[PDB]
Write a protein that binds this ligand. Sequence first.
Ligand SMILES: [Cl-]
Ligand SMILES: [Cl-]
Ligand SMILES: [Cl-]
Lengths: 305, 305
Amino acid sequence: SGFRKMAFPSGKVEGCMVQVTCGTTTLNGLWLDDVVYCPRHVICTSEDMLNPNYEDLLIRKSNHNFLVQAGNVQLRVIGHSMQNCVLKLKVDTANPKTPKYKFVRIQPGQTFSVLACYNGSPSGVYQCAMRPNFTIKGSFLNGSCGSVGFNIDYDCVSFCYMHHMELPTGVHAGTDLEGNFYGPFVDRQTAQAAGTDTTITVNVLAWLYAAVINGDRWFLNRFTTTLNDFNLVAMKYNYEPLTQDHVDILGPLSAQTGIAVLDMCASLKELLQNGMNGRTILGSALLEDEFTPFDVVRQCSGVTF
Amino acid sequence: SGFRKMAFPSGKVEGCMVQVTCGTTTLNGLWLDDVVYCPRHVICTSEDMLNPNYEDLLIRKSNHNFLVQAGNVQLRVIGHSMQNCVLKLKVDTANPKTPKYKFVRIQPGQTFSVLACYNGSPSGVYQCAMRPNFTIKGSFLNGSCGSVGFNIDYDCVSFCYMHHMELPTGVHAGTDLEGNFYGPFVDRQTAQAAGTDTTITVNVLAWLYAAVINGDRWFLNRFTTTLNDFNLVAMKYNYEPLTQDHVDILGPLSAQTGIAVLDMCASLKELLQNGMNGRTILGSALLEDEFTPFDVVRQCSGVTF
Ligand SMILES: [Cl-]
Ligand SMILES: [Cl-]
Ligand SMILES: [Cl-]
């Protein structure tokens, strides 16, 4: 037993990370088949980022200006193009380590693993969630751009995130692998502020089910509630509204534990209104919202890849 | 910026995980060069675990009784021996993916990454600490035995843990890669209880430095203290005593931030005596103690492998 914030094994993605340098700027790229994907602001200087015209900046870049290095070995760039906010660098060699993969655009509230990299080299792996304001709370230093987020289903890597930007408030913004930012953010160094960071209610409920499964159950009470009543409290506490779709997704955890979803909502309601009173749940003193119901089922059953 | 509970990239260890089956019991083994390491209780039935005599049980096992499978391919076992609480299975093929590696026995308070596996297949990666009572708090289901914990220094994997047991209280116990349990635990299904789970004071202080570096500093105050005074409070709150050795290890974080170590101790003292008052530090409502000073420096600087 036990329940931990767990990332996917990163080996399959490690084999895809390369370094990309354009002029004075170095960041990471993702090498799949014979294409390397990276943030288009690899072509920008620090000065350019204040007001970049990417189409004009790109005119001055040729294939040989994109230095792509896989480990100690250089890759030959035979073509390049811009798609939304990513560059696709065509190389003359297909990555021999390419896994089965897909590109996916995830919804707010979904979780994924991040492989933080610098200079094409992996530094660490950790679990994130796409927040309801379309930021993520990661660990990204200068040079981490082009690090990616992903999920694995058996043997297929679904890439869903590429890192592009840190907002002045310390949260992070990026794109899917087609180059489209999550949320309203842009790859300009300007005043863009995140909206309310609402809590992912369905994920909190999943995690309470995980706690019950793993022994922590002091928060279970004698009450129930309704969706509408619960959501009156959810709004007050900046929780996402809970929908019938969410209730349906929690069904399997409800069945495993015998605790009806609305009963667990009543437990969550009391936790919101009364606090933890100095107690903990699965080693946490706040309500964790970066485990999905699918995450809980997966970890509690031992799915492998 | 940002600070996350980060594990090492797991690729190098993924390439070493195999399945080991003896009779009706299947768990994981670690394949390095031409040796597979696994828990000796792979030879036990559930009944045997109540009072096993491993030397006697092993007499009935031959090389061909240890079924070792690497992916879809079977390995040939040409010898076996027991060393403390692990078996070493000699196979006729050296693992072609063997990384540079070392075996290390870690001290309480040191952290490491765990690659949770089932049937030789990786499930997920997460960060742990060797607790002061020589347990770890992991995520281990039936079949996870033989999963390992490790650190990476550039290109060399230092293996420090192999999973063997879950105590009735839900915490976990295991060995180094020479087969010696951490702490007083044994591979018998009996009444063994963990001692006090004291908090790793030096790690909490490291994490407060990480918070300051990453913007969270409301807990900084106008006070200082001394080692002896601080430790009077540490004892009351079941914190490890802070030593001059610990102060020395925190020196580099002290220098980066300009906050003297004893000043940070005074901040921690007030946090212990007054609580968080409903505030958070790096997204946590309790004081995190599973980041080492070396972890903080590493993550805040972007070390790669
Ligand atoms: Cl533009
Ligand atoms: Cl917490
Ligand atoms: Cl024995």
